[PDB]
Amino acid sequence: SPFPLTSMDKAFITVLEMTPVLGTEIINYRDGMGRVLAQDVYAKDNLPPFPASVKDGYAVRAADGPGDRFIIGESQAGEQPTQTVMPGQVMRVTTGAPIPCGADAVVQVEDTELIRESDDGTEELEVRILVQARPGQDIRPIGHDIKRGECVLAKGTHMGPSEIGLLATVGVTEVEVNKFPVVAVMSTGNELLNPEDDLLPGKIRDSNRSTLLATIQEHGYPTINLGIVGDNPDDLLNALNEGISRADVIITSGGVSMGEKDYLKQVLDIDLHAQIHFGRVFMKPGLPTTFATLDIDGVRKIIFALPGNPVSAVVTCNLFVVPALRKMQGILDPRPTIIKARLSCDVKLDPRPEYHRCILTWHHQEPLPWAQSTGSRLMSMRSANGLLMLPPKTEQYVELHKGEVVDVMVIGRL
Amino acid sequence: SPFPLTSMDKAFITVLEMTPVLGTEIINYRDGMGRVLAQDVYAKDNLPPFPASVKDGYAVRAADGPGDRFIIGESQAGEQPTQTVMPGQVMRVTTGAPIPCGADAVVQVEDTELIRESDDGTEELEVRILVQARPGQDIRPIGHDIKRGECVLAKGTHMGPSEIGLLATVGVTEVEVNKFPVVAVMSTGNELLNPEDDLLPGKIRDSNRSTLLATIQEHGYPTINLGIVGDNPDDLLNALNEGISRADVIITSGGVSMGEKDYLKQVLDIDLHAQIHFGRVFMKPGLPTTFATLDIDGVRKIIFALPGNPVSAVVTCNLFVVPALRKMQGILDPRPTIIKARLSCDVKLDPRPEYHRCILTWHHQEPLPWAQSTGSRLMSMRSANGLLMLPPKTEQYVELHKGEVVDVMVIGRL
Numbered sequence: 051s052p053f054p055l056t057s058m059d060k061a062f063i064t065v066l067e068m069t070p071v072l073g074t075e076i077i078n079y080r081d082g083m084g085r086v087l088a089q090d091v092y093a094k095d096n097l098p099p100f101p102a103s104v105k106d107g108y109a110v111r112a113a114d115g116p117g118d119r120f121i122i123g124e125s126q127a128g129e130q131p132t133q134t135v136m137p138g139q140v141m142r143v144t145t146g147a148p149i150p151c152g153a154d155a156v157v158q159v160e161d162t163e164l165i166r167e168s169d170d171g172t173e174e175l176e177v178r179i180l181v182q183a184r185p186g187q188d189i190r191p192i193g194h195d196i197k198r199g200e201c202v203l204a205k206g207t208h209m210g211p212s213e214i215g216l217l218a219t220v221g222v223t224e225v226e227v228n229k230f231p232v233v234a235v236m237s238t239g240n241e242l243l244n245p246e247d248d249l250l251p252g253k254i255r256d257s258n259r260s261t262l263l264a265t266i267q268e269h270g271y272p273t274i275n276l277g278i279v280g281d282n283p284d285d286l287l288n289a290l291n292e293g294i295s296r297a298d299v300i301i302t303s304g305g306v307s308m309g310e311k312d313y314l315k316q317v318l319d320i321d322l323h324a325q326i327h328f329g330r331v332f333m334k335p336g337l338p339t340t341f342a343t344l345d346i347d348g349v350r351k352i353i354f355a356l357p358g359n360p361v362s363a364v365v366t367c368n369l370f371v372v373p374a375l376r377k378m379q380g381i382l383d384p385r386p387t388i389i390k391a392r393l394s395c396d397v398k399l400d401p402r403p404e405y406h407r408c409i410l411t412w413h414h415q416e417p418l419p420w421a422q423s424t425g426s427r428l429m430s431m432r433s434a435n436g437l438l439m440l441p442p443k444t445e446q447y448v449e450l451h452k453g454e455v456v457d458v459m460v461i462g463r464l
Numbered sequence: 465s466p467f468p469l470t471s472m473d474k475a476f477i478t479v480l481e482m483t484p485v486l487g488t489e490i491i492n493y494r495d496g497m498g499r500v501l502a503q504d505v506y507a508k509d510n511l512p513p514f515p516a517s518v519k520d521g522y523a524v525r526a527a528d529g530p531g532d533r534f535i536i537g538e539s540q541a542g543e544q545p546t547q548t549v550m551p552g553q554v555m556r557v558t559t560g561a562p563i564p565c566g567a568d569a570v571v572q573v574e575d576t577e578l579i580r581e582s583d584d585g586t587e588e589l590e591v592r593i594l595v596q597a598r599p600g601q602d603i604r605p606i607g608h609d610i611k612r613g614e615c616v617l618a619k620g621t622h623m624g625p626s627e628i629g630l631l632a633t634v635g636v637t638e639v640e641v642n643k644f645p646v647v648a649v650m651s652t653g654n655e656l657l658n659p660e661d662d663l664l665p666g667k668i669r670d671s672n673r674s675t676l677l678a679t680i681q682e683h684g685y686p687t688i689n690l691g692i693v694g695d696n697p698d699d700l701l702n703a704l705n706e707g708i709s710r711a712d713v714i715i716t717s718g719g720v721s722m723g724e725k726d727y728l729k730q731v732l733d734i735d736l737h738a739q740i741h742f743g744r745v746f747m748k749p750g751l752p753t754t755f756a757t758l759d760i761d762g763v764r765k766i767i768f769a770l771p772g773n774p775v776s777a778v779v780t781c782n783l784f785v786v787p788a789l790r791k792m793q794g795i796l797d798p799r800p801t802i803i804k805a806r807l808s809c810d811v812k813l814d815p816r817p818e819y820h821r822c823i824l825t826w827h828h829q830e831p832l833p834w835a836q837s838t839g840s841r842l843m844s845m846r847s848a849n850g851l852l853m854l855p856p857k858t859e860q861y862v863e864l865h866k867g868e869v870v871d872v873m874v875i876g877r878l
């Protein structure tokens with residue numbers, strides 16, 4: 051009773067449709083990187099909160115016009131000025147300083163010439179204003195940039211450094227955001243040893259757990275390492291129950307081929323009572339990829355049972371798991387970014403859509419990047435930042451050639 | 465004595481030329497994300513370490529040809545088989561299982577038909593092999609993938625999840641890598657309050673420290689928050705000395721305009737005895753950007769004194785600081801990725817090269833992304849992932865138009 055071959059498109063939209071959006075929590079704004087706001091954010095103050103000089107120069111009365119002026123003082127950053135500027139007077143200003151009462155324009159220092167300074171040269175006393183200021187010129191009025199009561203960030207915003215800066219600006223230091231998913235990862239197989247182990251007969255080292263944990267951590271999500279679980283139903287069930295208790299998402303690898311001692315799909319259905327939405331996907335690599343949900347007490351747990359083959363495990367993790375995690379953490383459109391790139395060599399198409407890690411590189415002034423499939427010196431050292439997404443062959447199209455434009459999913463920093 | 469206007473190109477190559485590469489340390493391979501290897505890494509074992517089946521099926525003698533065979537047992541994942549396959553016999557195998565002595569090919573289960581099983585149906589006893597196996601078919605010989613003594617990762621490799629997986633595979637759990645830079649960030653100005661503060665007259669909240677710390681943290685580097693420092697030389701000097709003691713890199717903002725009570729450049733030169741390599745850059749925004757080095761006891765400290773304007777501070781941090789940090793952490797080519805994109809609206813060029821945060825988006829099947837400068841509903845919510853890099857105007861070129869292809873530095877995940 052093998053599972054139906056699910057099309058890639060159906061498998062992907064099934065993952066997104068079935069994956070929940072996690073609840074919310076309040077965080078400190080400094081912890082906001084990558085978080086999605088679950089509230090609108092409003093300014094409680096004006097920016098600037100005082101009329102502010104745009105320039106180093108002098109606060110003047112525009113109606114005085116050009117001419118020679120007594121400097122009555124300086125408006126300093128961080129100090130509300132005392133003095134009122136009267137006709138024939140000016141006050142020195144620096145960028146960002148408050149404009150004193152009496153002044154209605156700023157003349158930048160380049161449009162002036164100093165007439166008199168103190169004997170020790172530390173204080174300016176008289177200045178020539180060379181231009182006719184326009185009223186308001188080189189002043190940021192109160193609220194020019196942000197007004198009190200303005201919504202400055204909308205719920206749904208996926209925050210980066212500039213948004214954290216905006217929170218700092220408006221003094222909203224605690225915000226409601228969606229939670230991040232906690233992702234538990236286990237490996238399965240009697241043949242597996244820990245990375246720390248010397249080899250024993252018949253055995254290999256577990257690489258998927260490391261690769262998958264690192265992939266998830268690269269996207270900023272907390273992880274739980276559930277170790278290596280042997281090929282038997284009791285141990286698998288116990289490990290899955292641990293994952294369910296400790297995490298929002300359980301990723302397994304291995305144990306999902308058709309054939310002997312691959313028990314995971316049985317355990318998920320009969321013992322765990324999960325709903326397996328697909329158990330095979332028409333894709334290369336990744337045929338045995340399995341996706342299940344488990345609803346407990348009005349909470350939906352997500353389970354990805356990925357293929358054991360290490361290349362398949364990392365490919366399917368990027369295709370299916372990462373977008374699910376993005377939806378769980380509140381990203382409204384959780385689809386991965388897909389770009390167009392030129393194939394760096396000929397490739398044979400399969401009846402299945404096929405996927406392969408690659409390196410994306412821009413060449414001098416050429417508008418499209420090149421995609422070089424993994425496996426020169428320097429290029430063979432590059433870490434993969436793309437996943438080639440090649441179409442199924444048709445009776446028409448059987449091969450794609452060097453230079454032809456293909457889809458590439460971004461999986462690494464470009 | 466204002467500093468010369470340094471060209472953008474000179475300022476950038478000066479930063480890279482003058483920035484040191486940090487020393488090395490040994491880390492656990494699980495901590496390797498984003499690290500650069502400072503050693504070659506060799507395999508001490510073969511992969512696979514035993515001849516391994518590619519398929520679920522049967523290990524056979526190819527010389528037997530097709531026909532009916534007694535199944536003498538199963539080769540299980542994780543177990544070295546006991547039995548030798550003799551003429552007329554086969555052993556069941558699963559993918560990854562060791563090939564028993566006596567067998568020289570694997571026939572996949574689809575090319576067989578089962579003849580007899582145990583009464584309870586749990587054990588296969590006799591099978592029909594329908595095909596003539598080629599010797600070696602569907603077996604991964606010892607060392608097929610990785611050979612003992614093979615260099616699997618070269619020094620200089622910038623590691624991602626797949627490299628961490630490869631370390632796990634070959635059991636090299638501790639590796640030499642370049643250190644990451646520790647980056648101290650301070651804000652300057654008597655007008656600044658903490659994000660947590662209510663406003664007071666003449667004051668604003670410090671946003672640059674948050675924005676800069678978040679920018680640095682986004683790239684994975686450890687940070688130190690040095691707070692707000694007032695506009696006076698003693699306090700500035702003390703804060704810089706603290707930064708120097710605690711960190712590899714000091715980022716300040718503010719205090720770098722020409723004019724009153726901007727003391728930082730004096731303090732760096734006269735009090736700290738640093739070498740200021742440039743104090744102005746012909747760029748928009750970012751004119752007062754300052755870069756200095758300080759050599760203490762054969763250690764080179766890096767100091768970036770960025771403009772106080774928040775937009776300028778974040779722009780110059782991405783242009784100058786991030787590439788320096790990349791060089792410090794051992795990345796051989798620390799240049800940011802620059803892509804080609806289409807302008808989403810007309811823009812006026814300046815005599816200075818100009819830079820602006822933007823959002824990069826791909827449109828259905830169009831090969832080039834569009835770049836929309838920051839400042840629709842949904843687009844106005846996007847976090848910036850690009851920095852537009854617009855050329856200086858010429859007597860020829862004065863304006864660029866919607867749809868024209870421009871350079872964009874990637875600063876966010878695409």
Ligand SMILES: Nc1ncnc2c1ncn2[C@@H]1O[C@H](COP(=O)(O)O)[C@@H](O)[C@H]1O
Nearest residue numbers: 237256257258304305306358359559560
């Ligand atoms: N964690 C792992 N690390 C490396 N190889 C694995 C891992 N899990 C499974 N494999 C291999 O991938 C193949 C498929 O495993 P399975 O899906 O359990 O049949 C077999 O060759 C396994 O030995």
Ligand SMILES: Nc1ncnc2c1ncn2[C@@H]1O[C@H](COP(=O)(O)O)[C@@H](O)[C@H]1O
Nearest residue numbers: 145146651670671672718719720772773
């Ligand atoms: N940390 C900061 N956060 C927000 N605005 C700042 C910050 N530092 C400086 N500014 C403003 O940027 C402008 C330039 O400051 P400065 O370079 O100190 O003259 C002035 O308007 C300052 O008030």
Ligand SMILES: [Mg+2]
Nearest residue numbers: 238239304305
């Ligand atoms: Mg297995």
Ligand SMILES: [Mg+2]
Nearest residue numbers: 652653718719
């Ligand atoms: Mg200042």
